[PDB]
Amino acid sequence: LEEALEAKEELERTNKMLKAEMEDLVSSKDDVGKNVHELEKSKRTLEQ
Amino acid sequence: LEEALEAKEELERTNKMLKAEMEDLVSSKDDVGKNVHELEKSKRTLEQ
């Protein structure tokens, strides 16, 4: 039962780590693809 | 034995999660410092 509680906590921590890693990877991919980053279009983009 | 192995794996995963979170924070700080100049870059990052 102690191992089951620890495994639940470990699954939670692994989910949090995977979420953080996915966010970091998305940010890195966005920074890479920002080679153009048309701010004129981005105005309408993140206004709509 | 399985419980001890799972606890060790959970500790290693927590250490890896801490390291990955530190690395993600450092990468975000670097991207923000590169986006502070040309404020449109920081605006696009905030929009993303």
- CB of A37 within 8 Å of a chain B CB? The answer is yes
Distinct helix (H) and strand (E) counts, chain B: 2, 0
A22, A24, A29, A34 alpha-carbon torsion, rounded to 10°:
140
CA-CA distance, A13 to B15, in Å (whole number)? 10
Retrieve residue B2's tokens.
Answer: 């399985």
- Provide the H-helix boundaries in A1-48: 2-33, 39-45
Asked whether the beta carbons of B41 and A37 are under 8 A apart, the reply is yes
CA-CA distance, A33 to B24, in Å (whole number)? 18
Interface residue of B1, B9, B10 to substitute, partner A, most A CBs within 10 Å: B10
Retrieve residue B22's tokens.
Answer: 């530190």
Cβ pair B40:A39 closer than 8 A: yes
Cβ pair A14:B13 closer than 8 A: yes
